[PDB]
Amino acid sequence: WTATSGSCKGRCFELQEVGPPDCRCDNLCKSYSSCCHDFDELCLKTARGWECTKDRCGEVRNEENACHCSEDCLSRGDCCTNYQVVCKGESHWVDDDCEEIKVPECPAGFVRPPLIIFSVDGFRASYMKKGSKVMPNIEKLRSCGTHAPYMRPVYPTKTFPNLYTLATGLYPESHGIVGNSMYDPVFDASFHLRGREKFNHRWWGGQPLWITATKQGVRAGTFFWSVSIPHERRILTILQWLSLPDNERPSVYAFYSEQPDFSGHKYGPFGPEMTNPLREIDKTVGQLMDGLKQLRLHRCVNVIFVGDHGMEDVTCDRTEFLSNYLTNVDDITLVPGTLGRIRAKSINNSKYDPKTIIAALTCKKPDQHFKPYMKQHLPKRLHYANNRRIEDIHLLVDRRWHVARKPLDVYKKCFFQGDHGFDNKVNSMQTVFVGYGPTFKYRTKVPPFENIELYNVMCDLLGLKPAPNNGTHGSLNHLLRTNTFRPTMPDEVSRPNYPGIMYLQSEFDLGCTCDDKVENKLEELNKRLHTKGSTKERHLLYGRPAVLYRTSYDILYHTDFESGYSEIFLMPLWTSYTISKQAEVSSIPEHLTNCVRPDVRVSPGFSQNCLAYKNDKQMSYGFLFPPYLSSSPEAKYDAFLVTNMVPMYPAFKRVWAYFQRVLVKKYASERNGVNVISGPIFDYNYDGLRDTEDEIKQYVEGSSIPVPTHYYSIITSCLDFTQPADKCDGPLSVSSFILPHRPDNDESCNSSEDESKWVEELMKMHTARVRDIEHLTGLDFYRKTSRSYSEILTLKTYLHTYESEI
Ligand SMILES: *[C@@H]1O[C@H](CO)[C@@H](O[C@@H]2O[C@H](CO)[C@@H](O[C@@H]3O[C@H](CO[C@H]4O[C@H](CO)[C@@H](O)[C@H](O[C@H]5O[C@H](CO)[C@@H](O)[C@H](O)[C@@H]5O[C@H]5O[C@H](CO)[C@@H](O)[C@H](O)[C@@H]5O)[C@@H]4O)[C@@H](O)[C@H](O[C@H]4O[C@H](CO)[C@@H](O)[C@H](O)[C@@H]4O[C@H]4O[C@H](CO)[C@@H](O)[C@H](O)[C@@H]4O)[C@@H]3O)[C@H](O)[C@H]2NC(C)=O)[C@H](O)[C@H]1NC(C)=O
Ligand SMILES: O=C(c1ccc(-c2ccc(Cl)cc2)cc1)N1C[C@@H]2CN(C(=O)c3ccc4[nH]nnc4c3)C[C@H]2C1
Ligand SMILES: [Ca+2]
Ligand code: NA
Ligand code: NA
Ligand SMILES: [Zn+2]
Numbered sequence: 001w002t003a004t005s006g007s008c009k010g011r012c013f014e015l016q017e018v019g020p021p022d023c024r025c026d027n028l029c030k031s032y033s034s035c036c037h038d039f040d041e042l043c044l045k046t047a048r049g050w051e052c053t054k055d056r057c058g059e060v061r062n063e064e065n066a067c068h069c070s071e072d073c074l075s076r077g078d079c080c081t082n083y084q085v086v087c088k089g090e091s092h093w094v095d096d097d098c099e100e101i102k103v104p105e106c107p108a109g110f111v112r113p114p115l116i117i118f119s120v121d122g123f124r125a126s127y128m129k130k131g132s133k134v135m136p137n138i139e140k141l142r143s144c145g146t147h148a149p150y151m152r153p154v155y156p157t158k159t160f161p162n163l164y165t166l167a168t169g170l171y172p173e174s175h176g177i178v179g180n181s182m183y184d185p186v187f188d189a190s191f192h193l194r195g196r197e198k199f200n201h202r203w204w205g206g207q208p209l210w211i212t213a214t215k216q217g218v219r220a221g222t223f224f225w226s227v228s229i230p231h232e233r234r235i236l237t238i239l240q241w242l243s244l245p246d247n248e249r250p251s252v253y254a255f256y257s258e259q260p261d262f263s264g265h266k267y268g269p270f271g272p273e274m275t276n277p278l279r280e281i282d283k284t285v286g287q288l289m290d291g292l293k294q295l296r297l298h299r300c301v302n303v304i305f306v307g308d309h310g311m312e313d314v315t316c317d318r319t320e321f322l323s324n325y326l327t328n329v330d331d332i333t334l335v336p337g338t339l340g341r342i343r344a345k346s347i348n349n350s351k352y353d354p355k356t357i358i359a360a361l362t363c364k365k366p367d368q369h370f371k372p373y374m375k376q377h378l379p380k381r382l383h384y385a386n387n388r389r390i391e392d393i394h395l396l397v398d399r400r401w402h403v404a405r406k407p408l409d410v411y412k413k414c415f416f417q418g419d420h421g422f423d424n425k426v427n428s429m430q431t432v433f434v435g436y437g438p439t440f441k442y443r444t445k446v447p448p449f450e451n452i453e454l455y456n457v458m459c460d461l462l463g464l465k466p467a468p469n470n471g472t473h474g475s476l477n478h479l480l481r482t483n484t485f486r487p488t489m490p491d492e493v494s495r496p497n498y499p500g501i502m503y504l505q506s507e508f509d510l511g512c513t514c515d516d517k518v519e520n521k522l523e524e525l526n527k528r529l530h531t532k533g534s535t536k537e538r539h540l541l542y543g544r545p546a547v548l549y550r551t552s553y554d555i556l557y558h559t560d561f562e563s564g565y566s567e568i569f570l571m572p573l574w575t576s577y578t579i580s581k582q583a584e585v586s587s588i589p590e591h592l593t594n595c596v597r598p599d600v601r602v603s604p605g606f607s608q609n610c611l612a613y614k615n616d617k618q619m620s621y622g623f624l625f626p627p628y629l630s631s632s633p634e635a636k637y638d639a640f641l642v643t644n645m646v647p648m649y650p651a652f653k654r655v656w657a658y659f660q661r662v663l664v665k666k667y668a669s670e671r672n673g674v675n676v677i678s679g680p681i682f683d684y685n686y687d688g689l690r691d692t693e694d695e696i697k698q699y700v701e702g703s704s705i706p707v708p709t710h711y712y713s714i715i716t717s718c719l720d721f722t723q724p725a726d727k728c729d730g731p732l733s734v735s736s737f738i739l740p741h742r743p744d745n746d747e748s749c750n751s752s753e754d755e756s757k758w759v760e761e762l763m764k765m766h767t768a769r770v771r772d773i774e775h776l777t778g779l780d781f782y783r784k785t786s787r788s789y790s791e792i793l794t795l796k797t798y799l800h801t802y803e804s805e806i
Contacts, residue, residue, distance in 0.1 A: 077243025122261025169469025
């Protein structure tokens with residue numbers, strides 16, 4: 001109940017929210033059905049339109065007008081945005097040459113450059129180039145300010161998850177808005193685009209920029225606009241707020257456009273009808289910048305032009321129906337469309353089984369346009385599992401397609417030609433970032449980056465301390481002229497032991513054998529050198545990883561590789577080795593096929609054993625440093641140490657052996673040498689964070705050998721590939737992956753074929769940032785390079801996507 005008897009008189013677009021039943025006059029009241037009786041008449045004036053014409057100049061103030069062209073309008077802060085152009089001979093902002101803004105030029109009483117976030121829904125990154133002819137205002141912001149060729153959204157590439165990720169720096173699994181539609185089984189409550197539950201605070205986790213600002217004494221304009229408030233009015237409202245007295249005036253503002261998403265859904269991303277919405281958005285930008293220029297704020301304000309996600313061609317005919325796969329289609333609830341989420345229709349149904357549902361959905365049709373996953377098996381780069389609102393069963397839908405439960409859902413709910421939601425590495429889902437103002441750089445292009453990184457920068461722009469988030473603070477310092485945040489490397493928590501030879505071969509009873517009993521001071525002094533680190537500069541190029549948690553581990557040196565061996569987990573946390581362009585691949589000699597060798601630097605009690613693998617009928621083993629890449633037949637024996645062994649399902653060994661025998665050499669040839677760091681990951685509770693020893697759900701049968709959920713590799717080389725990986729003088733280049741360690745290759749529908757047809761495609765799907773591996777391992781990489789730390793942070797957030805040209 002709202003008693004709408006009060007008045008909006010002198011309260012139009014007031015900043016403080018007033019609770020029921022006193023009537024509201026803020027930009028949200030429409031959505032709440034709570035506006036005072038006179039809100040429209042007083043606050044939403046439209047009379048005479050939005051532009052001054054010659055004859056309006058000098059007019060006597062008529063209060064009924066939408067905006068004014070009277071002589072007092074500048075000081076009332078309520079001129080039409082084109083007033084100075086029409087009435088005072090000024091130019092439109094877009095027509096002025098751009099000139100570097102070296103320092104803020106703010107009027108008196110401005111304590112900091114204000115920040116204006118201009119967010120556009122469904123603005124696909126390629127619009128910046130493809131519509132540049134019809135968007136001169138946006139093209140000027142882009143060419144004169146700082147821009148990326150594209151910004152990567154979060155998964156799913158839906159509106160509410162991405163806008164709230166923009167506001168918080170958080171993955172949707174952490175902020176809680178994991179779709180536009182959700183069911184929370186703890187609340188027993190549903191979040192819908194339609195209705196009042198979505199307003200309830202309990203859906204919205206983390207701390208959005210406007211709350212961060214407010215808690216730290218920086219006032220914010222409201223970010224939310226009721227759909228019926230016309231864009232011209234939203235702009236006039238911002239400009240009016242910017243004329244408030246100093247103590248009242250917000251420092252951060254947001255504008256939001258429903259376009260081009262609205263038309264893109266109807267017409268497709270490049271429908272001929274899309275030119276007009278792009279023009280209109282440009283005009284709105286022109287209005288804002290002209291209005292800032294009148295207020296003398298156009299060289300004071302930092303403006304961010306940012307999208308939530310792109311738009312792909314999708315039509316009704318490209319829909320896959322679960323009724324063509326499942327017999328029990330009525331025992332399931334599906335969240336449908338460009339992603340699928342499946343749960344039981346009824347909690348009282350004990351004949352519901354996710355395993356038979358996944359199996360009925362796996363590789364069933366030749367050209368199947370979706371792939372099912374238990375959420376824990378989704379690519380770790382999606383970070384989409386650790387929330388109770390995310391259903392256990394997930395369908396990743398191919399770009400251009402939908403999934404639906406039954407055909408009746410698609411015709412009794414073609415209409416649409418565009419949609420979004422797909423995998424966030426898809427080219428069509430990329431969106432835009434432009435920053436313009438005194439704090440951003442001048443005419444600077446920056447590499448693509450992820451939207452989770454912006455919250456930190458928006459905090460930096462406002463002098464705020466960000467709440468804890470998933471951005472990596474300092475990774476976007478290269479966007480900024482000043483206000484850079486100067487991070488320090490994390491302190492190493494555990495120091496390594498450097499074991500020498502401490503055990504005799506007969507102290508070991510590991511059930512392993514090796515045909516290695518074959519035999520010289522020339523070569524013996526030499527192998528002693530290798531075991532103390534004499535080749536360590538070749539194989540460990542960026543310093544040893546730092547261990548950021550409390551544990552007990554040994555550094556082990558070898559001719560061809562170095563490792564940090566965990567006495568707790570019984571295997572390396574990391575193994576580092578360099579493969580030059582000239583290196584040669586060899587096979588494992590016949591007599592060494594089953595060779596495992598005790599490591600005389602590491603006690604039997606802190607070693608694995610071969611008996612456990614013999615007795616575990618499901619589990620085999622692989623090696624982190626690959627015997628195929630040994631530098632010499634004698635160095636090969638090091639690769640068969642028990643301290644280089646890791647548990648691997650036979651099915652996973654197919655992937656791993658192809659990566660090690662074929663792909664590392666291929667990368668070394670292509671990149672002029674590579675440095676590889678590989679190791680295990682344990683994330684049994686799928687939170688994206690290193691498991692402690694007591695979280696491990698699976699061991700090699702009858703042993704204390706923990707089974708990894710994933711294996712990672714970080715592959716680094718010189719960005720200037722004319723220099724070899726091991727003699728690189730400048731910036732680095734990296735690609736990484738986090739491969740799921742699974743007992744089957746059900747994920748790969750072509751896995752019955754030769755690895756050359758399916759392994760690399762698997763690995764591409766599981767591409768990752770170094771930072772993702774850092775979270776999963778508690779390791780910090782690239783501690784000793786000649787590069788600035790900020791540049792290294794950027795490298796660690798890089799994701800190699802394998803998409804073609806945007
Ligand atoms: C991305 O960045 C984010 C932000 O930094 C990272 O998320 C953080 O990670 C931490 C580790 O997972 C986590 O810390 C925990 O905090 C618990 C208290 O949390 C509340 O308070 C904070 C602060 O205001 C608040 O933000 C939290 O909000 C969550 O939950 C609400 C309501 O459900 C949601 O609205 C909100 O969206 C958010 O949900 C997300 O996080 C939670 C986990 O907190 C998930 O469950 C959700 O699925 C969702 O992802 C909370 O309101 C605190 O209780 C924890 O401490 C336990 O464990 C430690 C072990 O060290 C121990 O010291 C304690 O004793 C305690 O153990 C006891 O509880 C156990 C579990 O119940 C029980 O088993 C034991 O027996 C004990 O009784 C813990 O410190 C932090 O909350 C989140 N923050 C956010 C915002 O999500 C994220 O990791 C980053 N991702 C990556 C990949 O890097
Ligand atoms: O009020 C806001 C808001 C604006 C900006 C920021 C914002 C957040 C962070 C920053 Cl940094 C800036 C602005 C925060 C909220 N709304 C209201 C709008 C309602 N809505 C949809 O109904 C909708 C739209 C497109 C879709 N496609 N498919 N389904 C769709 C459903 C989109 C919502 C956005
Ligand atoms: Ca974990
Ligand atoms: Na076995
Ligand atoms: Na398969
Ligand atoms: Zn949309």
